[PDB]
Every structure is written in structure tokens, then in C-alpha cells.
Amino acid sequence: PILEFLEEWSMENLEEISPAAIADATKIFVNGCWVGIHKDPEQLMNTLRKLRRQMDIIVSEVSMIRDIREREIRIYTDAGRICRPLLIVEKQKLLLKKRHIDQLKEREYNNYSWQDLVASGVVEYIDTLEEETVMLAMTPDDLQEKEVAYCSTYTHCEIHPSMILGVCASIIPFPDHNQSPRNTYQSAMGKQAMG
Amino acid sequence: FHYAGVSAKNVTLGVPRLKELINISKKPKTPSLTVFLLGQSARDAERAKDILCRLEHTTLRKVTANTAIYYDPNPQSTVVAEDQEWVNVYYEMPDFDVARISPWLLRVELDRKHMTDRKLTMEQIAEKINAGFGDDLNCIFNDDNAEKLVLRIRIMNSDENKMQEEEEVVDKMDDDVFLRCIESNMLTDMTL
């Protein structure tokens, strides 16, 4: 489906490409196969991200990466890519709003769940390759809010920083107040506890 | 990782150094040599600098800003506008012109910063290149007053004549390819 859409959206195929024209245009790779080139990259990138956030043609797992300095757009539909969900920031405002959390709060008898949040475009899954092209905010309120200017172009926000830890390290209370080898050791000791 | 900046040198210490000493490895990871100066050279920093220059390997590639291989049929023609003056001065009383002049030209520009840092001399470099390749290379060097340091090199005039009636059609590397090989060898192994 992504290849069909790319053909629709003014992507000249490698076979039809004059070799001179490649130099000034971005190369589009899908699953590691150089499908073609696109003369106007940013519009295509925005359209692909809109489609993924609406979940129309591009599935949520599909990751689009644009390397601006190297003039390459890479789209991976491959399996085994590790992804984490992140909140989406438009302008400097989080897309997640009080109406969404009100619907989630009454999750029972409203049939509103995480899938509805993904379909609404509030959250998105981002793999590491796409993480390289993403400006993240650790905490929404602190970083998004205007201050002494550090970054005014945040594109995503972390849901909560404590989610970097795994299952065994999540049982540690006040992990940030311990030495790191001690957290590592507790992760191993917790597997051997009795209960 | 946890040495100090006081050393100001790469030093292998700890278990790897113990293994190097225990196995008596032919090649240490960081071979080093501590040189103690004999007399006034120790007292004065400038004399120590002289000894440093004496002890540190320097090649033409370190002091060469750029190299260009030109084709100039006539030395008097001076295809490069800049070398017109000193080529004309040298050919007012030309040397080795009687044998011939090789048309292919190797023009080497030497960075003044590196040249003065190692305290090298243009005449010194010319003498070293002449000694290394014998008479097969003819070198023309600018005066130090010139803003750009230029060294012009041509194939041997006797070799250009070939000094042989048969002349052999082998034509090994012609002259341009031979000049490129000469440039690479000079840059890598000049040992000025």
C-alpha cells in the first residue's frame, strides 16, 4: 500500500529517471529498496505522517525517516523494529487535551482506549531511527512552556520518564537516588525473591 | 581512561602493560622513548626545540600544501603565470638545458606555517630531493621573499633525451605516470 501511494504522490520510478536528475532530489527507500526519487521532499513527508496519524494507508508501526543532510527518505515496514509510544506536539502545545483524558478516565462504559488515542493522532509510535529525527520533551509542562529559549521546535513529548525502566527495575523505590550498579544488582535479586 | 593529563602522552598502564611485559611482545601497544638532553639544550627551550625537530620524522606530505602536475611544452612559456619571474631568472643562465627539458611539470606548494614550524629551508628541501633522486629530478625553488613557496620539478633532461640511439619503444609510464609515481614516493618517503 505504501508503494502504491508513493506512485500516486509524484514519485518518479528509478527506471524512468534520467540519471542527471537524481542529484538534486531525495531518494525514497522502502524496506531498504530504492523505489524512486521525489523532487519535493517535505510535502511528501508531511503527507505520510498525516496518513500514519489517521491510520488510513500507512499502519502505525510503519516508520518514516527523513535525513535532510543526506537527501534520503527511508520508510521501514519491516518486522522486529522496536518502538515506544510518544505524545505528539504541534506548535508548542501538546495534542493531548482534557477531553481525551476525560474520555479515558471513564474508560469503562465509554469504550475509549489506547487504540482510540492512537487513531485520534494524540500519540504515535517512534522507533530509534525515527527517534534520531525527533525533538523530545522529558516533561510536557516544563519544556513546552516558554522560558529562556532552548528549543521552540519540540515535535514529540515523553508520556512519563519512568517508563524507560523495565519490569524488574520498576519495583525499585526512588531509583534515581541510588547508585547505578545497585539498581542493576536489585534487578537481578528481585528475580530470585520468594512470593 | 583514568590516567591524568599531566602525562601529556599516550601511556599503557595496568593489566595490558603487565601482559606486554610478561609476554615480551615484540610490538608494544604504545612504544615510547624518554630523551634526556645533555647540556644547554636542556636549559633553554629553544635548543630543546631544535633537538625535537632533529628527532621527529618529517615528510614532504607534512609540509606540502598542494601538488599539481602540469604539461608545459616550453619552460620559457611558463604556463603558470606566477612562476614566470623565477623561471625566467633561472633560464637567463639555464642549467641542464643543454641535455633537454622535460615537458611534464610537477608543481608543489609548501605551506609556510609548517615550513617555519619545523624550521625547514627551501634550499634544504631542494638538496634533499636532489640527493634522493640523483639527477633524475631537476628542482626550481622560489626565494623566501615570495609570498607563495613554489617548488617546480621536471623529469631528468638526460632521461628525456634518453641518451640512447635505440631509444627503446618500451616507453614505461611515458612521463606523466612516472611523474605521478615520483610525487607519491616523494610525499610518502622523503624523510626530510
Binding site: Q179, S180 | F1, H2, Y3, A4, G5
Partner: peptide
């Protein structure tokens, strides 16, 4: 975890 000269 201390510095460059100390320990990690």
C-alpha cells in the same frame, strides 16, 4: 561516575 580522572 565521578569524573575523567576518577572512576566512571
Amino acid at each position: 561516575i565521578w569524573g575523567i580522572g576518577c572512576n566512571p
